[PDB]
């Protein structure tokens, strides 16, 4: 993405931005899954009727991962749009 924002580069015109954009999205997607997967598991932990309030505290880190992952995704999206615009300009 850094090489694709003008340079000094790339020398992969646009194409690079599209690739970079997907990678950020995938990165975000992976992050969303990992956080969720980890999260899903703890909530189920039946223990067992008078908890969950109660029970534990949870995330925590999750929250951050919940925010960080989201942020990452957003960034990826932005990158993708940038590449798209670049592509448009070339055409």
């Amino acid at each position: 993405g850094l090489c694709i924002a003008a340079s000094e580069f790339y020398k992969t015109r646009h194409n690079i931005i599209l690739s970079a954009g997907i990678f950020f999205v995938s990165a975000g997607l992976s992050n969303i899954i990992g956080i969720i997967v980890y999260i899903s598991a703890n909530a189920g932990d039946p223990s067992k009727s008078d908890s969950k309030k109660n029970s534990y505290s949870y995330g925590w880190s999750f929250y951050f991962g919940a925010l960080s992952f989201i942020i990452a995704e957003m960034v990826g999206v932005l990158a993708v749009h940038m590449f798209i615009d670049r592509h448009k300009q070339l055409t």
């Binding site: 749009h81 940038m82 798209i84 615009d85 670049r86 592509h87 448009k88 300009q89």
Partner: peptide, 27 residues
């Protein structure tokens, strides 16, 4: 090109806010 991505992101967000044959985005 940057605004063209904003107008589209708002269009896909409208295609998101729920309700041709480009097989890719079709499925």
């Amino acid at each position: 090109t940057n605004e063209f991505g904003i107008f589209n992101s708002l269009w896909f967000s409208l295609g998101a806010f729920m309700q041709p044959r480009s097989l890719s985005g079709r499925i």
